[PDB]
A paper describes a structure:
The structure is determined to 3.0 Å resolution and is indistinguishable from a cryo-EM structure of Ca2+-free BEST1405 at 3.6 Å resolution. The neck is closed in the absence of Ca2+, and notably, it shares the same closed conformation as in the inactivated and Ca2+-bound closed structures. The overall structure of the channel is very similar to the inactivated and Ca2+-bound closed conformations with the only notable differences near the Ca2+ clasp. In structures with Ca2+ bound, the five Ca2+ clasps, one from each subunit, resemble a belt that wraps around the midsection of BEST1. Without Ca2+, the majority of each Ca2+ clasp becomes disordered. 3D classification of the Ca2+-free BEST1345 dataset yielded only closed conformations of the neck but did indicate a degree of flexibility in the channel between the transmembrane and cytosolic regions that was manifested as a ~ 5° rotation along the symmetry axis. This conformational flexibility was not observed in the Ca2+-bound datasets, which suggests that Ca2+ binding rigidifies the channel. We hypothesize that this Ca2+-dependent rigidification may be necessary for opening of the neck. When unoccupied by Ca2+, the Ca2+ clasps are disordered, the neck is closed, and ions are prevented from permeating through the channel by the neck.
BEST1-4 proteins are expressed in the plasma membrane and form Ca2+-activated Cl- channels by assembling as pentamers. The channel comprises five BEST1 subunits arranged symmetrically around a central ion pore that is ~95 Å long. The diameter of the pore varies along its length and contains two constrictions, the ‘neck’ and the ‘aperture’, both of which are lined by hydrophobic amino acids. To address these questions we determined a series of cryo-electron microscopy (cryo-EM) structures of chicken BEST1 with and without Ca2+ in activated, deactivated, and inactivated states that represent the major gating transitions of the channel.
Residue numbers in the entry:
A (entry chain C), B (entry chain D), C (entry chain E), D (entry chain B), E (entry chain A): 16 to 299, 305 to 339
């Protein structure tokens, strides 16, 4: 199963390492052809004493430390951001059953509550993602996709605040469910409070995405691991050359014109640096798909599925 | 205890590494017999300078880094997927006691609720597993096993959605428990809300299996660790040869016809790569057993065990 | 404090490594005496070229990787199993106060509830432990210790299920607390539901021990780390010999008749493999003590301590 | 994306390593010029035998261990402190809806509750941060920013306690919400208890910041990793010198006047020590911004947004 | 900031490593003076062949593995024990408001409840700490500090149990709050159950300290890492000697009379073993301070702060 995953291209390592590899191939053979064709005899001698100096400081081992601890923090943080995505499904199961009414008003009342829950999720995704920000560059594009009505857009800007306004529909939700309770649509206080708790569960997950994006991996700690990988390949552009074996240096007794086991270390060390680079901004998760799923499912379960059940009949294991 | 676990075959390392080992044995002795029998005297000399080149780039240590951090992420993620399995037992203890009625209707009413809870678990297991998907290739096979009645199958397809419909029975559950409350079968709002919370507990565990399967370990990070293991064994097909000791190379002063301590490194490095490969798709967990347990226990505890208790008598420690 | 913990014997490393060490001492000096006394002069020469071959493949470093990542997964999983032990103390504090009645019936009613909670814990401990399984080999031994009355034993076998029946008393609990509520012993629905939630808290902890035991560390991943430790000591039975220093091999210029710094590596590498071996089955935790504590405390707090409090008098800090 | 993050200055590694680098450059070339210009011929010989001694104890590898495990504990603890920040948004959604009243009193009553919640967060941030402590050096500065009224300041000092008084407004909150319930402003006990639970959720997050600051990474464990980095660079001020290549030492056959691959190890090892140093006091998080956001949003959502909703009209997906 | 933390003494590494260092200095120069002054010429020769044998088995790298994984488990477990400390503040906010009454009885009733909560925390701290056990050697010392009245001391010993009796006041709490509810002091069942849940939250944190102390890091795993550190310094007492450079051994061409870079490895390896040793018994946390804080704050907030609030006046941001 791992033996066949090398041959895939889309989303693989070769599409991602296609540009940095051809730079490394170009800077390798250019230095080699200067040594092989251009430089004079004593100038070949000055290069060989420099390549032996560069070949010692390419210790493979302390580069493998800093890539291991860095990437393991990136992937761990990447898993926490997916667990912090607001799924509307817990509010959806309570709005669909405890907000009573099957007339025009109570149907409109349920559809407004689930449209506030998704709006409290879109307005944080368009600040932490670049794909959702390209889908909704302004607030008018949110109105065009029907997440926000033209009456809610005007109220959204009279509320004047210099901060991120993702918390606006999560206060509109709880004020509408109390207004729904005081008209008889929600029966009890216990059922009202159960709806208000799953709001604050989703309020807190939108408050984690608001925190993981703004507080990233430290920029100084990114820059350490990129120097040490580029420093390793810096010495390998000089140290891993094939010299002339006539001068009997230790470890250069065969010319091969191409370092096979050095270019495989490029797809190891630089490829394990591109792991952390692809995951440090994981929103450029199909989040345009994610919004289309959550909006379509939520409005479905509270409008087409409110108190209309299949017929209760006996199953196959009846006694 | 660890001393005797080497000799087991079923589920061991030797059943899993039987094919990749005989390829490695075949590619080893074939290269050796070309050096020993076919190649001429100067052609033996060109091989020996290539084997000394290959023997240096087989550094054992930076391969052991990338297998350690990779497999430790695989096993950690493997443990989270087992903790995310929906057990019906928490809903089962509340449906069996608070959904009152011992006539034909209330018995049918309890058995429908626990059959929706298992159906909200099967429809996510047949998307994350290949064994359950072979057990239920279509939705008609779910009806044949009695998880879904022929009235619920027709309602399940009138609900039109281009997404995974595992959320359908978790909305049918909460709408039936509210209908059960408004006929007098559930007594209070506090007992109704307690049933609706354990639904959303199981709704969230089905929503983790929906996430761990679709969002896997990154494909680029799989492909790094498989190059570096196969690159290590690539140099060992050339570097670990037994040369002629007459030419006095350092570390080749004895012919043995079989590298014992290299083939043990195959069962170390390739065997510690097969650990992550067996765990990255752990559903191909006896999940056909798991569904048969959860369905049989849930229907048992709400139908044979509703309010029929053993006789209250004094225990052994009575004063 | 660490300086004195070497000298302890009970539960130490020397009681655990007493058998594997004397095998390693025996296989060492036997190979040495063949080289020193039995083999001829050319046969001494063939051994010395084999010991130089074995001494290179005993790289200490890539063995220390696979023991570090393996044992750190074992100890982490070992800590999760202790946090998953059902303590009855949360149910005990609610049964002792909200299940009213001080006559013969309500006293019997409280003692039955806490005896179901411990029985829902014993029946999972006798499947995950070998010590509790030796304490209770059958179900009749559970009746002899008074956990199960002879009326509950007959009901326990009329309930026919091919699976583990630890879930039986956790359904008996919730059906008895509803019967207690409908006789006036529990006052309200809010107090009933609070008792039924701490049942499902303990139901879920018994459902983790049901999962950590059946789903272990993978058998292929155990077998990797035991080959690599035994392969390391395999080369050290040949490579770490003291040769004749007259032939001037590099690193053999002194005979000592006993490798002190190799036998210390046995108590390092094999001793750090016995860490994971002692922890991978941690039930062979004083779980016979644990059951005796939980049963005695639970029946105490609901029978001797129900609504009988010390006298309310003023403390030392009164104003 | 990682290729361009090297060139940034603000918040990068070069602003942080500007002072320690020029000390290291100064102590390098000063020792070199003493060897090159000042010392006599035999005194050059005594230095060269000292530089060969220093060059062996600069093992790069066991320094990379202790920096990896240390920094990974620092960054993990740094992520826990951001998850422990009290956001007022969960209390804000319940105070804005369940504390009824639109007259002068109930508007004043809501604004007092959210001003106690922020005050229970500021008084712990001015003990764990130095930026908030510079913003509020005394308690009078808290009154000047309007967090505390001049009547609450006098009560705050009559309460005499030798400890940190951050727990004072979290007891004032719960006593005011009970007084609000007993005047009819909060309707039920279920809605009162829901407000009192989100207080204790925020009480516990303020109790984590009270614990992460006082209980830090151990001072002995900080001092280990700083010796080992400074010891590594101590040997490199002697060992990494360019000697005279006329005396044919192994690894000194070329003069370069500047160690390029040693100064890159300064920006690797010392730069990966400055990662943990910047994160071990992460409050010197824009916490002056954080207080200005939370105070302005909380008073907004309970005063301008209490029960004043946009007009319920049909969305774009109406049928 | 890290540059100045070397110079501190109190709580540093030098106070902790003052005894083990002077032993290591004494055993070093004693062996050196035997080689330099006492032993004869051939006896100097037998030492030099032993020091070359000892210098190879002091591989720095596989000692750094076992200290890294061990200490990272110690510090992780050390952080969990601080998060498991029972703070009384969540019970304190509910007892201070929902236990009504301002006369002599209800004031006495509140002060008894918070004195049971601290007593359920002290009786577990005097079993897991040695400082609290020295503060309270018996149960009579608990009465002298006013935690337990002389009426509660007599009831505490009539309850006969061979186990740790820390669970006694956590059952007295819940029985007193039910007695307070049935006299009209607590209003509703919802407010009673909210007090009984924060008891079981604190009951579970006292049940973690009861578990982290009794179930420690395994004794076999402590003893591994202490052999391997002491074995490393064992070879360094022989291998790191300065020999006579007249005999031209590789790596001994300069006498220095003091190994500077070996004694720095003592403050690295032994100092990183003292990290885990100081943290494995972290109670010998200012827990005498902790009890004095929690008792004084809890009795304060329920007696001086019950329903006596500051005057509601308008803040600075009024409109």
């Amino acid at each position: 199963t791992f033996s066949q995953l090398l041959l895939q291209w889309k989303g693989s390592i070769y599409k991602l390492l296609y540009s940095e590899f051809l730079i490394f191939i170009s800077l390798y053979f250019a230095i080699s052809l200067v040594y092989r064709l251009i430089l004079s005899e004593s100038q070949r001698l000055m290069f060989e004493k420099l390549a032996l100096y560069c070949n010692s400081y390419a210790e493979l081992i302390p580069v493998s430390f800093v890539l291991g601890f860095y990437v393991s923090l990136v992937v761990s943080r990447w898993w926490a951001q997916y667990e912090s995505i607001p799924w509307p499904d817990r509010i959806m199961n309570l709005v669909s059953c405890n907000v009573d009414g099957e007339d025009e008003y109570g149907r409109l009342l349920r559809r407004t509550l689930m449209r506030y829950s998704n709006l409290c999720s879109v307005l944080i995704l368009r600040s932490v993602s670049t794909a959702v920000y390209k889908r909704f560059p302004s607030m008018e594009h949110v109105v065009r996709a029907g997440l926000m009505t033209p009456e809610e857009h005007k109220k959204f800007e009279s509320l004047n605040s210099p901060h991120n306004k993702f918390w606006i529909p999560c206060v509109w939700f709880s004020n509408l469910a109390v207004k729904a309770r005081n008209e008889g649509r929600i029966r009890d206080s216990v059922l009202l409070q159960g709806i208000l708790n799953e709001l604050n569960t989703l309020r807190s997950q939108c408050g984690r995405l608001y925190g993981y994006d703004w507080i990233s991996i430290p920029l100084v700690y990114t820059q350490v691991v990129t120097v040490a990988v580029y420093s390793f390949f810096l010495a390998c552009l000089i140290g891993r050359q094939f010299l002339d074996p006539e001068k009997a240096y230790p470890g250069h007794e065969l010319d091969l014109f191409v370092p096979v086991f050095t270019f495989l270390q490029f797809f190891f060390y630089a490829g394990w640096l591109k792991v952390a680079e692809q995951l440090i901004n994981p929103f450029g998760f199909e989040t345009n798909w994610l919004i289309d799923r959550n909006l379509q499912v939520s409005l479905m379960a509270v409008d087409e599925m409110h108190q209309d059940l299949p017929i209760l009949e006996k199953d196959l294991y009846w006694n």
